[PDB]
Amino acid sequence: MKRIVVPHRWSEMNRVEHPPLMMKQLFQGVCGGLRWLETKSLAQYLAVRAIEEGYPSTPGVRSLQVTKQKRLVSYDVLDCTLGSGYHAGAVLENGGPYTRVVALDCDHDAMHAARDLVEEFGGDRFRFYCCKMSEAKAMFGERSFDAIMIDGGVSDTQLEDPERGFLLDDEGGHRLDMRFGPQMGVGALEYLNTVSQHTLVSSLLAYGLLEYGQAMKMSRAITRRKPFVDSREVLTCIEQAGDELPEGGWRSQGSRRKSPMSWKFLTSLRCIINNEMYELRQGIENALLMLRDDGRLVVFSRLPWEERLVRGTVDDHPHALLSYVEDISIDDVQIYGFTRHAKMWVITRAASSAYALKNTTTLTEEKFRESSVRWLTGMYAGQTHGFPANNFTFENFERKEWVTLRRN
Amino acid sequence: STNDAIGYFLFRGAAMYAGMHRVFFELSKQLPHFVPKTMLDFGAGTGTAILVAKEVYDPGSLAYPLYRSLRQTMQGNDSSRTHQLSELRYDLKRLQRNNEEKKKVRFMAVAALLERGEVDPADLPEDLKREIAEVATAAATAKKDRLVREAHARYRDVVDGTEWESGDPLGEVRASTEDPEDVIDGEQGDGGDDGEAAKGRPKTWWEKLIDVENETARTRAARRLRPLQEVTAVEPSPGMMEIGTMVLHDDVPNVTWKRYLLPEDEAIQHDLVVAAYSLSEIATSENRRRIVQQLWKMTKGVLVFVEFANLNNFNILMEARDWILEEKDVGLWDWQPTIVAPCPHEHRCPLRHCKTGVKRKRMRICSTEAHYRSTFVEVWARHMPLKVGIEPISYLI
Amino acid sequence: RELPRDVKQELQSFVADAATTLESRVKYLKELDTMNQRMKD
């Protein structure tokens, strides 16, 4: 009677977790809102109804057949990236009862954080899948969650692993497999060994950092000296073109424009591989589809192009409204070692008239003269009578579609 | 860029889609028993070929249903034949059966379940009512499939306000369950030898009607024949990748987007390699012969080249055909290249070496033609309203 | 006062003919290709 124990690796016993970024500012953001106060008022409405029917109480001041019982007051939250599960646990612990978190991730190593969250409480309050944040609307549909929280970047678990890349001060040749999950292709060693000089510059300029005068210098250095068998030869060539790496490594508390070209190249090559421009643009715009009316969206931005992407999305989306923007407190930067430029974007969804609130502040005389021309010339026209355009309508069903649901 | 990818997809989407449906229709007719569990798509700018292969080999797992009346939805593959058998059984129940006894059992069962839910006593006094029970849970699974077909999105059952099942939240014991359905030929036992002795028994049409009419074996035949498990798409340009990811993620889940083919990437093995409209787009600096040889090296099954019908394109495709048929006598016979379609002789193409094609450009391209319903951007850009658009394609299977 | 530049370019993209623009740009690409081929010999 023997037990077959699996031999552990170096990265399993020496695994560290991600520190909690903010807990009390998140619980006010990802929970609190219009969807939360109607949740808390309905729970008090069921409390005074339970004492009305005759249930045992205490002295105190006030679908189909097998799924007959549906759940009560519960507040459904979607987690696009749980990481170490501290932000996913902050919603469920501080929310108490009537709250739920569905968590997604790219890596299978986030099952360890999902396993420990189930052991405290599980089965009906936590749910985990392994997918990107852009594929959330494809597997949950529109108006699916009361709230959606979005984080971005790397956790502290993936930074310290020798197999997961992201090691700058190890003094050893490891493969530069710096990606968040198996849903992407080649790593950075296989990227830089095969990418052309022109393809790398156009991908570096898309993220704002490492502009065209500096990115053409880094791409001159990469493509001219690229037999790259290890990350030791990569970091030698990067630091020879620009300055050396900062003392903090990936986390630099200095200014963005005063950061060296070696740090600007490495934080953009991290952004080139995992496609954080695409995943944050899709993950925010899909979230405004999946939210209910007057739901909350919480985005964490640690990079200046991410602050441009959130600012550009809310002003253009005809339901998104920034409730408030809170930065990181100074005490979290010392003990945990986070970025000083980390902000929290709390975006809410509007039921209607989302553009009338934005027209109060930003409505110039030039935009009024452009608006008259677009009505006169009719440039706001779309397409209805084409072949794919006749099969497309709005969200509310028509009279001809309701008779189709009866037979089908 | 991304604007070039917007215009390229909106201009050529229906044309490339019709070409891929034509070539996959010929592939499903010529090879019925080929189910491509692993698909690599070389040069997958937009995933039109991946979407066409998903529609051909898995019509039921799409977000939106197919136009069932069209000829394009009748393929030769066993998964497509299974889905067509399900839709044909629906048509047989609806149209060729005038009796309302099926509806009688249906509303009797609905009223009986609604009455036993909270009103009647328990079902133990009525003996041997398992025929209601197993068809009830089968109809419940059909109801879950109905919700998936209604919301156009899987995992809709966790969205609604039902209580989640206590136990297995992460889904680990559903993926680590030992399956008792797949039995290797040595694992069978405890049976009478007279069943394995007498062979050639189910050759009667009545026993074929028994084998067709039952629906319990349908899911058991579909669970082993998984049509598309892993799909890898290769695209170097970022705009093409970020639009093809918008296209493919609605209906083809878990597509790994590689950015380049590596010379060390030929050690991974795929069932179907599709290069649609990509051999002409390979630059002059890159060695196209090594790319074609590497693409042939990654085929357990079928390699499909699809391209527009042009002179330079036909020269590229005929050179690639010669390069791959050069690899015949180099090893084991069971892995030698054979062309299934179109050329049946495996010599040089007689239209490529014909007398008339010296001074006549029209007698040079051994191609085929696909017809499609043209969209509004094509009739906007070409000044004529084409109710039927024409796409000439050259292909090689 | 004349129109601003971006609405003028978008209006020229909106209301002009597509087939004449396509034919002129394709024959311009053909003329450039004949110039490149004449330079290559």
Binding site: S196, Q197, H198, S202 | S1, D4, S285 | R25, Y28, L32, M39
Partner: peptide
Amino acid sequence: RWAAKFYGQVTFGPRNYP
């Protein structure tokens, strides 16, 4: 000016052809 737009998309090799 439609042909000058794609000059930012040419690879650095053939950007200096004539």
